[PDB]
Design a protein around this ligand. Structure first.
Ligand SMILES: OC[C@H]1O[C@@H](O[C@H]2[C@H](O)[C@@H](O)[C@H](O[C@H]3[C@H](O)[C@@H](O)[C@H](O[C@H]4[C@H](O)[C@@H](O)[C@H](O[C@H]5[C@H](O)[C@@H](O)[C@H](O[C@H]6[C@H](O)[C@@H](O)[C@H](O)O[C@@H]6CO)O[C@@H]5CO)O[C@@H]4CO)O[C@@H]3CO)O[C@@H]2CO)[C@H](O)[C@@H](O)[C@@H]1O
Ligand SMILES: [Ca+2]
Ligand SMILES: [Ca+2]
Length: 420
């Protein structure tokens, strides 16, 4: 009885807090009326906490605003559920208020108040809430537990079941509300595109969707590339091709990944999830907030080089040093503006990460948000095993994640693709 695609035939929520930050930058008004997801990055964000990350508006404030913006017609707001115990277990920049042993608090003091507020808007027949479920959680239990590269925190979150159970709890509590549409976070191709990562991620997604009373029927779909930078389509790169006595997969960039872009990845992931037992009508989202890679450095066509790494590096639109470079990526532009059913199996390209909000601080900054200094956000960081021991490629002088980052917004705007 819920629509096949919550984005189809609907106005899109404009977040007034984000809108005002965007319009305040030079040329910012050009994107100020784009739709961006509202993040519930802590318990305080539910009622409203007057914070750097979420301003003065609580959830009810946003949902009342969304109803106002709607004109009684279908309107879709995206709400990010992002507060698991031991949140961000393989990193530090977005560790949260709830520790690894605090599932009970997540349930009763985070999910339960959110579900209560959303139940109050269930009598608004034309309000559609897209709930985006726990970014950067379940794939950590596949890729960051094995010890050789992993973390003890992620290993613990696997053994105590906090991620799996927290997600399943959110899926049922929110999924049983008549106008709520759950999309599970599905990393991106640069994380789980590999043979050793792909199937085991499908497995854990399925595990989580059957935890805490949930079934696959509470899952409307999946989102990739949330708060990341991976190309939607790599027009001049074919992951299975050659140059010229060597495989594209042998390049430093591809590095034996099965995918070079998000689209081919979500399309394959969609088929595998269905075969695993997810509903056949599931739709994928791709977060295109920051994956445009436009401006004067965007390749105009395939390279003429017959050197493997040179062909790849000159042909690729994702201009990062390594696909594991996730923080405040230098040279990134705004991607495709939110669009309905842009491709087979894709419900929408969406702006979930709000452009201009930081991925993390480039130095130690004292905070009350539970966030530590993550060296992947330090421009001078020479890296580790997860990123091929490469420079971070992070932008200098970045503030705490979620805080406004003027330099990043300006660059993103300048490098928008397609051009504004
Ligand atoms: O403004 C709104 C709110 O923002 C919140 O902050 C966000 C923030 O914006 C965001 O940046 C962040 O999310 C990131 C995570 O913190 C981070 O840990 C994560 O890193 C991933 C990375 O995406 C991925 O590329 C990497 O892939 C690894 C993989 O694990 C590994 O298995 C694979 O191994 C293969 C080798 O590469 C290969 O050599 C060998 O042959 O095969 C191996 C396979 O067997 O290698 C790849 C490397 O490419 O994994 C890491 C994790 O380990 O990325 C996230 C972004 O995608 O945090 C927040 C949420 O996203 C604020 O907190 C909030 O206040 C605001 O409201
Ligand atoms: Ca659908
Ligand atoms: Ca190096």
């Amino acid at each position: 009885e819920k629509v096949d695609n919550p984005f189809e035939g609907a106005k899109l929520y404009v977040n007034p807090v984000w809108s005002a930050k965007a319009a305040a930058e030079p040329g910012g008004s050009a994107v100020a009326n784009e739709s961006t997801a509202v993040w519930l990055d802590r318990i305080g964000a539910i009622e409203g906490n007057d914070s750097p990350t979420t301003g003065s508006m609580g959830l009810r404030d946003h949902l009342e605003e969304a109803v106002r913006q709607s004109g009684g017609d279908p309107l879709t707001i995206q709400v990010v559920i992002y507060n698991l115990p031991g949140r961000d277990c393989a990193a530090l920049a977005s560790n949260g208020e709830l520790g690894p042993d605090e599932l009970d608090r997540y349930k009763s003091e985070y999910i339960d108040p959110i579900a209560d507020i959303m139940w109050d808007f269930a009598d608004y027949e034309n309000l559609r809430i897209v709930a985006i479920i726990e970014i950067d959680s379940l794939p950590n239990l596949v890729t960051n537990v094995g010890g050789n590269g992993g973390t003890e925190l992620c290993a613990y979150m696997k053994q105590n079941g906090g991620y799996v159970n927290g997600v399943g709890y959110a899926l049922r509590k929110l999924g049983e509300i008549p106008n709520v549409y759950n999309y599970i976070d599905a990393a991106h191709h640069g994380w789980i595109g590999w043979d050793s990562n792909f199937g085991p991620s499908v497995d854990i997604f399925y595990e989580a969707a059957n935890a805490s009373g949930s079934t696959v029927d509470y899952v409307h779909g999946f989102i990739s590339n949330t708060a990341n930078y991976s190309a939607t389509v790599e027009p001049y790169l074919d992951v299975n091709g050659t140059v010229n006595g060597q495989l594209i997969r042998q390049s430093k960039w591809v590095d034996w990944n099965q995918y070079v872009d998000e689209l081919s990845f979500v399309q394959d992931l969609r088929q595998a999830l269905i075969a695993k037992g997810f509903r056949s009508d599931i739709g994928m989202l791709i977060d295109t907030s920051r994956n445009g890679w436009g401006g004067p450095n965007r390749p105009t066509g395939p390279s003429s080089s017959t050197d493997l790494n040179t062909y790849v590096d000159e042909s690729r639109i994702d201009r990062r040093i390594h696909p594991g470079n996730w923080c405040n990526q230098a040279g990134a532009g705004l991607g495709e503006r939110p669009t309905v059913n842009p491709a087979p199996g894709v419900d929408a390209y969406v702006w979930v990460k709000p452009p201009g909000e930081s991925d993390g601080a480039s130095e130690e900054i004292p905070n009350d948000e539970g966030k530590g200094f993550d060296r992947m956000c330090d421009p001078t960081y020479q890296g580790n095993a997860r990123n091929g021991n490469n420079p971070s490629g992070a932008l200098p002088n970045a503030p705490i994640s979620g805080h406004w980052f003027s330099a990043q917004f300006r660059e993103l705007l300048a490098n928008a693709y397609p051009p504004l």
